[PDB]
Amino acid sequence: GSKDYDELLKYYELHETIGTGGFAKVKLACHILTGEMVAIKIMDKNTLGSDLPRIKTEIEALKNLRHQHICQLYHVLETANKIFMVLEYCPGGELFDYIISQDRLSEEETRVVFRQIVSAVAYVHSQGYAHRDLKPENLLFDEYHKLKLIDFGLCGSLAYAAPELIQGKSYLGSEADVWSMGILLYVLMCGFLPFDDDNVMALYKKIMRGKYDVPKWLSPSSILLLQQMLQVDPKKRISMKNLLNHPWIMQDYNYPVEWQSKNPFIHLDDDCVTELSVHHRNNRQTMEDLISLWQYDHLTATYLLLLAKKARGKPVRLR
Ligand SMILES: CN(C)C[C@H]1CC[C@H](N2C(=O)NCc3cnc4ccc(-c5cc(Cl)c(O)c(Cl)c5)cc4c32)CC1
């Protein structure tokens, strides 16, 4: 109802719907106080049904994941019938779009993108999580052409799922993510899937078999990294630690993947704390302690959006 939007519309101006993926809608919106554009995931609690616990799973995970290549959660607002998630806006489109418009990426272009994927996923695993749904549709570009991983509903698409997922057997989520990243690496450099079939049963068999075509344009180093990631035996898959400084990964770079987060939880920006304090009528030390609770209310949304507004070189001012 209109009651479900009262608190929301005190903080954001709604623009057009930019996507109806899954069972939720995502709208473009503008944070009134800072002017920064955000994405708002709208969910109807009476409609989510049994997919509703997975929404709590994604929120709890997003509250615990803060990293330059993970879509940032700014604000969680729950009403009587709606759950609102205010997220980092990614106008650059999906990695799916980038691949399909450049029928395939070169090895150099692939390394630029893949190193960001390895960065996000390695950080996810360092926090005790596994994504379990890695796919080009879940990686978006911002306005700086930097990748952002989205959709933590599981902590999946069949062509990216590891064979042990297909059989329904037990599995470690981290090893399942490495397989999907191997499928990602193949798609990035070939433009098509390594295992594909119009019939699901035939795709089941092709995945579990593990054999795939190796196009002629793949470098020898690309091939061996692929077979190091696309191992049917999950215990023979390359680990994440070995991926961070893998020879292929480091070609043209000569430094391992910077997987650790730079967006902190501890340190606060004094310019942002100052601008916030002179806008809520309370002393600065109280404003500093309130921000540090990280409730993902309007306060933390305003802080991190003002933080991002500052990084863009815009004046660190409110409204
Ligand atoms: C079908 N799913 C699996 C893949 C689709 C999902 C919608 C995407 N999307 C658009 O519809 N237009 C552009 C666009 C721009 N900024 C976005 C910012 C955040 C999110 C976001 C973040 C999280 Cl954490 C999350 O859970 C969800 Cl659902 C969305 C989506 C955005 C977006 C496109 C890929």
Coordinates of N, CA and C in Angstrom, one line a residue, residues 127-289:
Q127 N 35.3 -14.7 4.1 CA 34.3 -14.3 5.1 C 33.5 -15.4 5.5
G128 N 33.8 -16.7 5.1 CA 33.0 -17.8 5.4 C 31.8 -18.1 4.5
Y129 N 31.7 -17.4 3.4 CA 30.6 -17.6 2.5 C 31.0 -18.2 1.2
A130 N 30.0 -18.7 0.4 CA 30.2 -19.2 -0.9 C 29.0 -18.7 -1.7
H131 N 29.3 -18.2 -3.0 CA 28.2 -17.6 -3.7 C 27.2 -18.6 -4.3
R132 N 27.7 -19.7 -4.9 CA 27.0 -20.8 -5.4 C 26.0 -20.4 -6.6
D133 N 26.2 -19.2 -7.2 CA 25.4 -18.8 -8.4 C 26.2 -17.9 -9.2
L134 N 27.5 -18.1 -9.4 CA 28.4 -17.3 -10.2 C 28.1 -17.5 -11.7
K135 N 27.8 -16.4 -12.4 CA 27.4 -16.4 -13.8 C 27.5 -15.0 -14.3
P136 N 27.7 -14.8 -15.6 CA 27.8 -13.4 -16.2 C 26.7 -12.5 -15.9
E137 N 25.5 -13.1 -15.6 CA 24.3 -12.3 -15.3 C 24.4 -11.7 -13.9
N138 N 25.2 -12.3 -13.1 CA 25.3 -11.8 -11.7 C 26.6 -10.9 -11.5
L139 N 27.2 -10.5 -12.6 CA 28.3 -9.6 -12.5 C 28.0 -8.3 -13.3
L140 N 27.9 -7.2 -12.7 CA 27.6 -5.9 -13.3 C 28.7 -4.9 -13.3
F141 N 28.7 -4.1 -14.3 CA 29.7 -3.0 -14.4 C 29.1 -1.7 -13.8
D142 N 29.9 -0.9 -13.1 CA 29.5 0.4 -12.7 C 29.8 1.4 -13.8
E143 N 29.8 2.7 -13.5 CA 30.1 3.7 -14.5 C 31.6 3.8 -14.7
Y144 N 32.4 3.1 -13.9 CA 33.9 3.1 -14.0 C 34.4 1.8 -14.7
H145 N 33.5 1.0 -15.2 CA 33.8 -0.3 -15.9 C 34.5 -1.2 -14.9
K146 N 34.1 -1.1 -13.6 CA 34.6 -2.0 -12.5 C 33.5 -3.0 -12.2
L147 N 33.8 -4.2 -12.1 CA 32.9 -5.3 -11.9 C 32.3 -5.3 -10.5
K148 N 31.0 -5.7 -10.4 CA 30.3 -5.8 -9.1 C 29.5 -7.1 -9.1
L149 N 29.8 -7.9 -8.1 CA 29.1 -9.2 -7.9 C 27.8 -8.9 -7.1
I150 N 26.7 -9.6 -7.6 CA 25.4 -9.3 -7.0 C 24.7 -10.7 -6.7
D151 N 23.5 -10.6 -6.1 CA 22.7 -11.8 -5.9 C 23.2 -12.9 -5.0
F152 N 23.3 -12.6 -3.7 CA 23.7 -13.6 -2.7 C 22.6 -14.4 -2.1
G153 N 21.6 -14.8 -2.9 CA 20.4 -15.5 -2.4 C 20.8 -16.9 -1.9
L154 N 21.9 -17.4 -2.3 CA 22.4 -18.7 -1.9 C 23.8 -18.6 -1.3
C155 N 23.9 -19.0 0.0 CA 25.2 -18.9 0.7 C 25.5 -20.2 1.4
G156 N 21.0 -22.8 -8.6 CA 21.8 -21.9 -9.5 C 21.6 -22.3 -11.0
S157 N 22.1 -21.5 -11.9 CA 22.0 -21.7 -13.3 C 22.7 -23.0 -13.6
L158 N 22.1 -23.9 -14.5 CA 22.6 -25.2 -14.6 C 23.9 -25.3 -15.3
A159 N 24.1 -24.5 -16.4 CA 25.3 -24.6 -17.2 C 26.5 -24.1 -16.4
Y160 N 26.4 -23.5 -15.3 CA 27.5 -23.0 -14.4 C 27.6 -23.8 -13.2
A161 N 26.8 -24.8 -12.9 CA 26.8 -25.6 -11.7 C 27.8 -26.8 -11.8
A162 N 28.5 -27.0 -10.7 CA 29.5 -28.1 -10.7 C 28.8 -29.4 -10.8
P163 N 29.5 -30.5 -11.3 CA 28.9 -31.8 -11.4 C 28.3 -32.3 -10.1
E164 N 29.0 -32.1 -9.0 CA 28.4 -32.6 -7.7 C 27.1 -31.9 -7.3
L165 N 26.9 -30.7 -7.9 CA 25.6 -30.0 -7.7 C 24.5 -30.7 -8.5
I166 N 24.9 -31.2 -9.7 CA 24.0 -31.8 -10.6 C 23.4 -33.1 -10.0
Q167 N 24.3 -33.9 -9.4 CA 23.9 -35.1 -8.7 C 23.2 -35.0 -7.4
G168 N 23.1 -33.7 -6.9 CA 22.5 -33.5 -5.6 C 23.3 -34.0 -4.4
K169 N 24.5 -34.5 -4.6 CA 25.3 -35.0 -3.5 C 25.9 -33.8 -2.7
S170 N 26.5 -34.1 -1.6 CA 27.1 -33.1 -0.8 C 28.3 -32.4 -1.5
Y171 N 28.6 -31.2 -1.0 CA 29.6 -30.4 -1.7 C 30.1 -29.3 -0.8
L172 N 31.3 -28.8 -1.0 CA 31.8 -27.6 -0.4 C 31.5 -26.5 -1.4
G173 N 30.9 -25.4 -0.8 CA 30.5 -24.3 -1.7 C 31.7 -23.6 -2.4
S174 N 32.8 -23.6 -1.7 CA 34.0 -23.0 -2.3 C 34.5 -23.7 -3.5
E175 N 34.4 -25.0 -3.5 CA 34.8 -25.8 -4.7 C 33.8 -25.7 -5.8
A176 N 32.5 -25.5 -5.4 CA 31.5 -25.2 -6.4 C 31.7 -23.9 -7.1
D177 N 32.2 -22.9 -6.4 CA 32.4 -21.6 -7.0 C 33.6 -21.6 -7.9
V178 N 34.6 -22.4 -7.6 CA 35.8 -22.5 -8.5 C 35.4 -23.1 -9.8
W179 N 34.5 -24.1 -9.8 CA 34.0 -24.7 -11.1 C 33.3 -23.6 -11.9
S180 N 32.4 -22.9 -11.3 CA 31.7 -21.8 -12.0 C 32.6 -20.8 -12.6
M181 N 33.6 -20.4 -11.8 CA 34.6 -19.5 -12.4 C 35.4 -20.1 -13.5
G182 N 35.6 -21.4 -13.6 CA 36.2 -22.0 -14.7 C 35.2 -21.9 -15.9
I183 N 33.9 -22.1 -15.7 CA 32.9 -21.9 -16.8 C 32.9 -20.4 -17.2
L184 N 33.1 -19.5 -16.2 CA 33.2 -18.1 -16.6 C 34.4 -17.8 -17.4
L185 N 35.5 -18.4 -17.1 CA 36.7 -18.2 -17.9 C 36.6 -18.7 -19.3
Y186 N 35.9 -19.8 -19.5 CA 35.7 -20.3 -20.8 C 34.8 -19.4 -21.6
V187 N 33.7 -19.0 -21.0 CA 32.7 -18.1 -21.7 C 33.4 -16.8 -22.1
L188 N 34.2 -16.2 -21.2 CA 34.9 -15.0 -21.5 C 35.7 -15.0 -22.7
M189 N 36.5 -16.1 -22.9 CA 37.4 -16.2 -24.0 C 36.9 -16.9 -25.3
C190 N 35.7 -17.6 -25.2 CA 35.1 -18.3 -26.3 C 33.8 -17.7 -26.8
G191 N 33.1 -17.0 -25.9 CA 31.8 -16.5 -26.2 C 30.6 -17.5 -26.2
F192 N 30.9 -18.7 -25.9 CA 29.9 -19.8 -25.7 C 30.2 -20.6 -24.6
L193 N 29.2 -21.5 -24.2 CA 29.4 -22.3 -23.0 C 30.2 -23.6 -23.4
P194 N 31.0 -24.1 -22.4 CA 31.7 -25.3 -22.7 C 30.8 -26.6 -22.7
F195 N 29.8 -26.5 -21.9 CA 28.7 -27.6 -21.8 C 27.4 -26.9 -22.1
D196 N 26.8 -27.3 -23.3 CA 25.5 -26.7 -23.7 C 24.7 -27.7 -24.4
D197 N 23.4 -27.7 -24.2 CA 22.5 -28.6 -24.9 C 21.1 -28.1 -24.7
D198 N 20.2 -28.2 -25.7 CA 18.9 -27.7 -25.6 C 18.1 -28.6 -24.6
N199 N 18.5 -29.9 -24.5 CA 17.8 -30.8 -23.6 C 18.6 -30.9 -22.3
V200 N 17.9 -30.7 -21.2 CA 18.5 -30.7 -19.8 C 19.2 -32.0 -19.5
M201 N 18.6 -33.1 -19.8 CA 19.2 -34.4 -19.5 C 20.5 -34.5 -20.2
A202 N 20.6 -34.1 -21.5 CA 21.8 -34.2 -22.2 C 22.9 -33.2 -21.6
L203 N 22.4 -32.1 -21.1 CA 23.4 -31.2 -20.5 C 23.9 -31.8 -19.1
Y204 N 23.0 -32.4 -18.4 CA 23.4 -33.2 -17.2 C 24.6 -34.1 -17.5
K205 N 24.4 -34.9 -18.6 CA 25.5 -35.8 -19.0 C 26.7 -35.1 -19.4
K206 N 26.6 -34.1 -20.2 CA 27.8 -33.4 -20.7 C 28.6 -32.8 -19.6
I207 N 28.0 -32.1 -18.6 CA 28.7 -31.6 -17.5 C 29.4 -32.7 -16.7
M208 N 28.7 -33.7 -16.3 CA 29.3 -34.8 -15.5 C 30.4 -35.5 -16.2
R209 N 30.3 -35.6 -17.5 CA 31.4 -36.1 -18.3 C 32.6 -35.3 -18.2
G210 N 32.5 -34.0 -18.3 CA 33.5 -33.0 -18.2 C 34.3 -32.7 -19.4
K211 N 34.1 -33.3 -20.5 CA 34.8 -33.0 -21.8 C 34.2 -31.8 -22.5
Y212 N 35.0 -30.9 -23.0 CA 34.6 -29.7 -23.7 C 35.6 -29.5 -24.8
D213 N 35.1 -28.7 -25.8 CA 35.9 -28.4 -26.9 C 36.8 -27.2 -26.5
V214 N 38.1 -27.3 -27.1 CA 39.1 -26.2 -26.8 C 39.4 -25.5 -28.1
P215 N 38.8 -24.3 -28.3 CA 38.9 -23.6 -29.6 C 40.4 -23.3 -29.9
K216 N 40.7 -23.2 -31.2 CA 42.1 -23.0 -31.6 C 42.7 -21.7 -31.1
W217 N 41.9 -20.7 -30.8 CA 42.5 -19.4 -30.4 C 42.9 -19.3 -29.0
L218 N 42.7 -20.4 -28.2 CA 43.1 -20.4 -26.8 C 44.6 -20.6 -26.6
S219 N 45.2 -19.8 -25.8 CA 46.6 -20.0 -25.6 C 46.9 -21.2 -24.8
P220 N 48.1 -21.8 -24.8 CA 48.4 -23.0 -24.0 C 48.2 -22.7 -22.5
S221 N 48.5 -21.5 -22.1 CA 48.3 -21.2 -20.6 C 46.9 -21.1 -20.3
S222 N 46.0 -20.6 -21.2 CA 44.6 -20.5 -20.9 C 44.0 -21.9 -20.8
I223 N 44.5 -22.9 -21.6 CA 44.0 -24.2 -21.6 C 44.2 -24.9 -20.2
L224 N 45.4 -24.8 -19.7 CA 45.8 -25.5 -18.5 C 45.1 -24.9 -17.3
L225 N 45.0 -23.6 -17.2 CA 44.2 -23.0 -16.2 C 42.7 -23.5 -16.2
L226 N 42.2 -23.7 -17.4 CA 40.8 -24.2 -17.6 C 40.7 -25.6 -17.0
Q227 N 41.6 -26.5 -17.4 CA 41.5 -27.8 -16.8 C 41.9 -27.9 -15.4
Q228 N 42.6 -26.9 -14.9 CA 42.9 -26.8 -13.4 C 41.6 -26.4 -12.7
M229 N 40.7 -25.7 -13.3 CA 39.4 -25.2 -12.7 C 38.3 -26.2 -13.0
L230 N 38.2 -26.7 -14.2 CA 37.1 -27.6 -14.6 C 37.5 -29.1 -14.4
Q231 N 37.7 -29.4 -13.2 CA 38.0 -30.8 -12.8 C 36.7 -31.4 -12.2
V232 N 36.3 -32.5 -12.8 CA 35.0 -33.1 -12.3 C 35.2 -33.6 -10.8
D233 N 36.3 -34.1 -10.5 CA 36.6 -34.4 -9.1 C 36.8 -33.1 -8.3
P234 N 35.9 -32.7 -7.4 CA 36.0 -31.4 -6.7 C 37.3 -31.2 -5.9
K235 N 37.8 -32.3 -5.4 CA 39.1 -32.3 -4.6 C 40.3 -32.1 -5.5
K236 N 40.2 -32.2 -6.8 CA 41.3 -31.9 -7.7 C 41.2 -30.5 -8.3
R237 N 40.2 -29.8 -8.0 CA 40.1 -28.4 -8.5 C 41.1 -27.5 -7.8
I238 N 41.6 -26.6 -8.6 CA 42.6 -25.6 -8.0 C 41.9 -24.8 -6.8
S239 N 42.7 -24.6 -5.8 CA 42.2 -23.8 -4.7 C 42.2 -22.4 -5.0
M240 N 41.5 -21.6 -4.2 CA 41.4 -20.1 -4.4 C 42.8 -19.5 -4.1
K241 N 43.5 -20.0 -3.1 CA 44.8 -19.4 -2.8 C 45.8 -19.6 -4.0
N242 N 45.8 -20.8 -4.6 CA 46.6 -21.0 -5.8 C 46.1 -20.2 -7.0
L243 N 44.9 -19.7 -7.0 CA 44.4 -18.9 -8.1 C 44.8 -17.5 -8.0
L244 N 45.1 -17.0 -6.8 CA 45.4 -15.6 -6.6 C 46.8 -15.2 -7.2
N245 N 47.7 -16.1 -7.3 CA 49.0 -15.9 -7.9 C 49.3 -16.9 -9.0
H246 N 48.3 -17.4 -9.6 CA 48.5 -18.4 -10.7 C 49.3 -17.7 -11.9
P247 N 50.1 -18.5 -12.5 CA 50.9 -17.9 -13.6 C 50.1 -17.1 -14.7
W248 N 49.0 -17.8 -15.1 CA 48.1 -17.1 -16.1 C 47.5 -15.8 -15.5
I249 N 47.1 -15.9 -14.2 CA 46.5 -14.7 -13.6 C 47.5 -13.5 -13.5
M250 N 48.8 -13.8 -13.4 CA 49.7 -12.8 -13.1 C 50.4 -12.3 -14.4
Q251 N 50.2 -12.9 -15.6 CA 50.8 -12.4 -16.8 C 50.3 -11.0 -17.1
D252 N 51.3 -10.2 -17.4 CA 51.1 -8.7 -17.7 C 50.9 -7.9 -16.4
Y253 N 50.7 -8.6 -15.3 CA 50.5 -7.9 -14.0 C 51.6 -8.0 -13.1
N254 N 52.1 -9.2 -12.8 CA 53.2 -9.5 -11.9 C 53.0 -9.1 -10.5
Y255 N 51.7 -9.1 -10.1 CA 51.3 -9.1 -8.7 C 50.1 -9.9 -8.5
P256 N 49.9 -10.5 -7.4 CA 48.7 -11.4 -7.2 C 47.4 -10.5 -7.1
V257 N 46.3 -11.2 -7.2 CA 45.0 -10.6 -7.1 C 44.8 -9.9 -5.8
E258 N 44.5 -8.6 -5.8 CA 44.2 -7.9 -4.6 C 42.8 -8.2 -4.2
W259 N 42.7 -9.3 -3.3 CA 41.4 -9.8 -2.9 C 40.8 -9.1 -1.7
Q260 N 41.7 -8.6 -0.8 CA 41.3 -8.0 0.4 C 40.4 -6.7 0.2
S261 N 39.5 -6.4 1.1 CA 38.6 -5.3 0.9 C 39.4 -4.0 1.3
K262 N 39.0 -2.9 0.6 CA 39.4 -1.6 0.9 C 38.3 -0.8 1.6
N263 N 37.1 -1.0 1.2 CA 35.9 -0.4 1.9 C 35.9 -0.9 3.3
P264 N 36.2 -0.1 4.3 CA 36.3 -0.6 5.7 C 35.0 -0.5 6.4
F265 N 35.0 -1.3 7.6 CA 34.0 -1.1 8.6 C 34.4 -0.2 9.7
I266 N 35.7 -0.1 10.0 CA 36.2 0.6 11.1 C 36.4 2.0 10.9
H267 N 37.3 2.4 10.0 CA 37.7 3.8 9.8 C 36.5 4.6 9.2
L268 N 36.3 5.8 9.7 CA 35.3 6.7 9.2 C 35.9 8.0 8.6
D269 N 35.3 8.5 7.6 CA 35.8 9.7 6.9 C 35.3 11.0 7.7
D270 N 36.3 11.8 8.1 CA 36.0 13.0 8.9 C 35.2 14.0 8.2
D271 N 35.4 14.2 6.9 CA 34.6 15.1 6.1 C 33.2 14.7 6.1
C272 N 32.9 13.4 6.0 CA 31.6 12.8 5.9 C 30.9 12.9 7.3
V273 N 31.7 12.6 8.4 CA 31.1 12.7 9.7 C 30.8 14.1 10.1
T274 N 31.6 15.1 9.6 CA 31.3 16.5 9.8 C 30.1 16.9 9.1
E275 N 29.9 16.6 7.8 CA 28.7 17.0 7.1 C 27.5 16.4 7.6
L276 N 27.6 15.1 8.1 CA 26.4 14.5 8.7 C 26.0 15.2 10.1
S277 N 27.0 15.5 10.9 CA 26.7 16.0 12.2 C 26.0 17.4 12.1
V278 N 26.4 18.2 11.2 CA 25.8 19.5 11.0 C 24.5 19.4 10.2
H279 N 23.8 18.3 10.4 CA 22.5 18.1 9.6 C 21.5 17.3 10.4
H280 N 21.9 16.8 11.6 CA 21.1 16.0 12.5 C 20.9 16.6 13.9
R281 N 21.6 17.8 14.2 CA 21.5 18.5 15.4 C 21.9 17.6 16.6
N282 N 23.1 17.1 16.6 CA 23.8 16.4 17.7 C 25.3 16.5 17.6
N283 N 25.9 16.3 18.7 CA 27.4 16.5 18.7 C 28.1 15.4 17.8
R284 N 29.3 15.7 17.4 CA 30.0 14.8 16.4 C 30.2 13.4 17.0
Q285 N 30.7 13.4 18.2 CA 31.0 12.1 18.8 C 29.8 11.1 18.8
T286 N 28.6 11.7 19.1 CA 27.4 10.9 19.0 C 27.1 10.5 17.6
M287 N 27.3 11.4 16.6 CA 27.1 11.0 15.2 C 28.1 10.0 14.8
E288 N 29.3 10.0 15.3 CA 30.3 9.0 14.9 C 29.9 7.6 15.5
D289 N 29.4 7.6 16.7 CA 29.1 6.3 17.3 C 27.8 5.8 16.6

